[PDB]
């Protein structure tokens, strides 16, 4: 099977800064899909095929990476963008990176 390790588990930031979340796989040579899930709502597609944004997604969500290292960078954070982020490759999902307010 495919095991996806997703880190950092909890990322505490303030708005305006840049977030970086990296997903490690077991096999290489495939794509990576990045989902946004706010609290108490429906999940949302952000990134498919490791670098392409979904429809209705602003350009501040950038994703890249290759092989095993898969990077998701969110520069210029918003008050709304604080949520949970998942990496899904095929049917094997990640566990979740929570994005928290720092004070």
């Amino acid at each position: 099977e495919i095991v996806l390790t997703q880190s950092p588990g909890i990322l505490s930031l303030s708005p305006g800064e840049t977030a970086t979340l990296f997903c490690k796989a077991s096999q290489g040579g495939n794509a990576m899909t990045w989902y946004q899930k706010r609290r108490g709502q429906v999940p949302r597609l952000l990134i498919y095929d490791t670098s392409r944004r979904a429809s209705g997604v602003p350009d501040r969500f950038v994703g890249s990476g290759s092989g095993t290292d898969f990077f998701l960078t969110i520069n210029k954070l918003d008050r709304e963008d604080f949520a949970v982020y998942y990496c899904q490759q095929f049917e094997f999902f990640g566990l979740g990176s929570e994005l928290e307010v720092h004070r």
Partner: protein, 452 residues
Amino acid sequence: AENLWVTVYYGVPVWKDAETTLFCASDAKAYETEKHNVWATHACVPTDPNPQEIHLENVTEEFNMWKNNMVEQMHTDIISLWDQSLKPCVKLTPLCVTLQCTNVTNNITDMRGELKNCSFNMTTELRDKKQKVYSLFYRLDVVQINSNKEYRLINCNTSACTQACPKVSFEPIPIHYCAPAGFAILKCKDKKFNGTGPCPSVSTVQCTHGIKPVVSTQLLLNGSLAEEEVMIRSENITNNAKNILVQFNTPVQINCTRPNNNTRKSIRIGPGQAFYATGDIIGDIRQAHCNVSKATWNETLGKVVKQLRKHFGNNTIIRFANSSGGDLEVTTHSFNCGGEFFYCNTSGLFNSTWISNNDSITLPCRIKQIINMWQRIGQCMYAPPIQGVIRCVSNITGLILTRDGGSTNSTTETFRPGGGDMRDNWRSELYKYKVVKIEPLGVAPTRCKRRV
């Protein structure tokens, strides 16, 4: 001579990838048995009797059968032509009527239906009169709408359906694809060609090989077989939604039949319209079946298990299961045989397990008379019954598989049959081809001038 003056060249061999329409070319030998017997004996050009491929040299072209456009044009052309071979035939609107059905005369055991003896009113040549008439329908074509019971046909809820004229045969004739002017068709020839990537030995050709169009779901029949060894093909093997095509080396043989000696009977629905009904079952009531050789099938599964262990690791437990479920003609094995559509249960082949180190298999078959292939909105057809016991013999060229798996790291890899899209049956015969566009105007430097 340090200066170089630019020169144009018109007619230079250089191509770029493009997509266009391709005109089909059937062989003229089918014209010797003329008069609309099979389709495209009139709507198709005869071939060049001298096909001539031209083997190129030191050339590399990237092939990709999964993003091919020629298979999509073939899937459109067969549907459009198949609809164009039903418009002159009789529409079966007036037969959609309340049926009064009973069991067929048989020592009924209280565990099977499978035949129904249905009497109903029907119009005549004249408009005023009417006639009581009986027929034999299968159980998959009648539905109890709510003494003897009271049924109706299944297509009556949505759409009346044209029956197929028995002058029109269903059997495949080989369809060639001659490229038009300006374009060209390449051909891989590498025996180890995976399906995607560079084929380092190509050959242009003006018109493709013999493609006989079969229609089959679980395992494709009469399909050009590979030469060196049994091969598998996919798009991403670690993906689940994509099928895993398999093409054999040795054609395992299947024999299929229908033992019931029917009697075709003509009923005149209307003036100039005749309806063909199953009149009587003389002989004996015996269920339709298929046979393959058990030893060659065990050997052929041994070959495909030997091939599948490369992509998955040498220590895995490959096992085969029957279909997961769904509609009828994706779980069972669908094909046509002498103009009558079988549906054959294939759980008797797909149960095994495989660890790292004479007889013949019977398998039952069920028959529908109405069919709805390609799943349109309001078009089915009523395949008329055929006189006498029929049987047909076919080589099995390959089969279509499907892997599954959610989680929990087990060493097994259960494979199940597929079907679904009809295009996969064409992607096992247009894999080695690619269409290209000539751009014959190239430009280059050399030392010359033009004299004023």
